C-alpha cells in the first residue's frame, strides 16, 4: 500500500509518495518528521539504497518520527515489505546453521527467555519478513530480514551479533 512521507511533524509541509520501493528519495523528500501508510508495512532507511539505520513502520500515522523509533528526521530510502499469510524463522547459536538452534512462528518480545544465548550468528528465513530487533521488547537497533539464508550477523546488516527480540512483519488490518 502507499507510505505518504512528509517534510514537518503532524502531516504538514513538504510531501512525496511511494508505492513501492524507492532507493533514492533525497530528490523528493528533504527530511521526514511525519509519515502516513495507507495499508501494509515499510522499512525505512536512513541512507539512500537500503542503508544506514533501519525503521519499521506498518498502517498507521505516524505525527514524529519518534514515533517509528527514529533517530532523526534523516529517511533516504524505503522499501515495500511484502506480505504473508504465514511466518516461520530459525535461529542459530553459531555462523553457517551450526551449533542450537530455535524456530519461532509467532513474536518473541525476549529471546532470552527461550533461548539461552545473548547472540545469535546465523539465521534461516523460511517463511515471512521479520524485524529483528538489538533489544528485548522491540527495541534498538533493527533489522530487516525477508525470506532467505543468513549465514552471519553481516548478512542482515548487523555490525554484531546481540538480538533481543523479533517480530513477525504483520498488518493485523
Known amino acids: 500500500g502507499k507510505i505518504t512521507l512528509y517534510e514537518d511533524r503532524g502531516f504538514q509541509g513538504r ?5 513501492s520501493d524507492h532507493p533514492n528519495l533525497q530528490p523528493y523528500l528533504s527530511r521526514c518528521n511525519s509519515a502516513r501508510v495507507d495499508s501494509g508495512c515499510w522499512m525505512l532507511y536512513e541512507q539512500p539504497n537500503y542503508s544506514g539505520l533501519q525503521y519499521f513502520l506498518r498502517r498507521g500515522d505516524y505525527a514524529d518520527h519518534q514515533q517509528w523509533m527514529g533517530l532523526s528526521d534523516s529517511v533516504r530510502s524505503c522499501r515495500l515489505i511484502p ?3 504465514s511466518h516461520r524463522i530459525r535461529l542459530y547459536e553459531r555462523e553457517d546453521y551450526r551449533g542450537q538452534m530455535i524456530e519461532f512462528t509467532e513474536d518473541c518480545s525476549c529471546l532470552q527467555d527461550r533461548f539461552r544465548f545473548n547472540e ?6 523460511l517463511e515471512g519478513s521479520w524485524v529483528l530487533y538489538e533489544l528485548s521488547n522491540y527495541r534498538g537497533r533493527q533489522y530487516l530480514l525477508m525470506p532467505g539464508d543468513y549465514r552471519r550477523y553481516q548478512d542482515w546488516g548487523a555490525t554484531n551479533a546481540r538480538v533481543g527480540s523479533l517480530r513477525r512483519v504483520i498488518d493485523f488490518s
Open 83 to 85: 506480505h504473508s499469510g
Open 120 to 125: 545469535i550468528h546465523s539465521l534461516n528465513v
Open 15 to 19: 510531501h512525496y509518495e511511494c508505492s
